[PDB]
């Protein structure tokens, strides 16, 4: 039935999507050669959702890879599962972005987005029922931010009735990875708030904190954080591929999770998370998953949700469970902590149950929360952006390409209006 076109831009996006496709190929029993060698019919029942069948018992992941520098794509091709992608969809330039959003959005993106869109159209014409587009990208990377904004605008113009989902890496509250992160983040949000349907805000800081405190990892890598992000990504769309007692596709998620069209940024979560030694000491139950999900320390977004209220909560469970068990847990959660949900939305939690657990687990659950506390993140970004813009810090790099002061001013105004809207609804 429904299908998904996975778009993968930037260095961050390329790495996250490589790990994501490794996980997806593992879930469907597909070896690095593309030949299916699984053990269950459900692996092939909805294999078309992400894979095109190239005759010869081989399947090609319906993925599109975008970058302005060929090094990351070289690493992807040479690494494991590098041959799993049909080499037709490696669309890359030569200049690179240099973390300049203006560059990647007006010059290098303007040069490469035509080939990117041609590949997108070719992949979409092969679809029986296109459901939504997925974009994996960071907000700080010039390639990620610029290519994402430009390509999202173009695709929204071409397909106005399709779902535009993005998984964005947001700036950290303590340590910056790029000096000009604020300009890129502000100019990216200034378009994401207009063209996207929903955006999942994942911060690397929260990932480090979770993998250190919970998983007890001492040497975490980008691979481990990408593994967590990929587990979340797979839990998001597990209902589009496997049967269950209560299924919910992308359209129901977008409807239930976005009360007003502009308040569409969410904080994802995941459960269960345990260290290796502690696995033998804690029973895996639905109450345990519910307790782990609704906890501030397990939020992958660097924002304490106890500082605001929730507009809505999505909780997709995986594995065999009792419906009454999940319902009772959700009722207890809403009743004991009613002070953290807005008074103008009753029945704040929408749930779904998939009958296929992640490999190695008896059951799991994916958390998706629309909390008004993300105004903290947006206000921090706005304040830092204002502090930099008041002194024309690094402004000439953006102005030389074609941007003017009016664009930065309008972006700041839009950001502050979004913050004011979140404050209004809290």
């Amino acid at each position: 039935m429904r299908e998904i076109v996975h778009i993968q831009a930037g260095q961050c996006g390329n790495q996250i999507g490589a790990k994501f496709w490794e996980v997806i190929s593992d879930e469907h029993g597909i070896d690095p050669t593309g030949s299916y060698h699984g053990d269950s019919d459900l692996q092939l029942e909805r294999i078309n959702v992400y894979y095109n069948e190239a005759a010869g018992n081989k399947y090609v992941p319906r993925a599109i890879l975008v970058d302005l520098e060929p090094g990351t794509m070289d690493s992807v091709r040479s690494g494991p599962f590098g041959q799993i992608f049909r080499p037709d969809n490696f669309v890359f330039g030569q200049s690179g972005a240099g973390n300049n959003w203006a560059k990647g959005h007006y010059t290098e993106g303007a040069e490469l987005v035509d080939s990117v869109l041609d590949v997108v159209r070719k992949e979409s014409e092969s679809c029986d029922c296109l459901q939504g587009f997925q974009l994996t990208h960071s907000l700080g990377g010039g390639t990620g931010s610029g290519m994402g904004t430009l390509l999202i605008s173009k695709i929204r113009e071409e397909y106005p009735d399709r779902i535009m989902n993005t998984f964005s890496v947001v700036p950290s509250p303590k340590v910056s990875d790029t000096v000009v992160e604020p300009y890129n983040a502000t100019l990216s949000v200034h378009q994401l708030v207009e063209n996207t349907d929903e955006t999942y805000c994942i911060d690397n800081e929260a990932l480090y904190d979770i993998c250190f405190r919970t998983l007890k990892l001492t040497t975490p890598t980008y691979g481990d954080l990408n593994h967590l992000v990929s587990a979340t990504m797979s839990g998001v769309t597990t209902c589009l591929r496997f049967p269950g007692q209560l299924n919910a596709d992308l359209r129901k998620l977008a409807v239930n999770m976005v009360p007003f069209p502009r308040l569409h940024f969410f904080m994802p979560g995941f459960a269960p998370l345990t260290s290796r030694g502690s696995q033998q000491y804690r029973a895996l139950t639905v109450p345990e998953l519910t307790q782990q999900m609704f906890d501030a320390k397990n939020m992958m977004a660097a924002c304490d949700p106890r500082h605001g209220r929730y507009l809505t909560v999505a909780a997709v469970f995986r594995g065999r469970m009792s419906m009454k068990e999940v319902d009772e847990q959700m009722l207890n959660v809403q009743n004991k902590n009613s002070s953290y949900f807005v008074e103008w939305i009753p029945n704040n939690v929408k749930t779904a149950v998939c009958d296929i657990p992640p490999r190695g687990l008896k059951m799991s659950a994916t958390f998706i929360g629309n909390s008004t506390a993300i105004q903290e993140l947006f206000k921090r970004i706005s304040e830092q952006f204002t502090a930099m813009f008041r002194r024309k810090a690094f402004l000439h790099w953006y102005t030389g390409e074609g941007m003017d002061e009016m664009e930065f001013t309008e972006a700041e105004s839009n950001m502050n209006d979004l913050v004011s809207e979140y404050q209004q609804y809290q």
């Binding site: 813009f389 008041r390 002194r391 024309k392």
Partner: peptide
């Protein structure tokens, strides 16, 4: 019958060039 070639040298009034205060308002 000579005198040393001493000149009165001064960078009198030099203003900055980077408009670091142009958006201070």
């Amino acid at each position: 019958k000579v005198q040393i070639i001493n000149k009165k040298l001064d960078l009198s009034n030099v203003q900055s060039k980077c408009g670091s205060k142009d958006n201070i308002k």
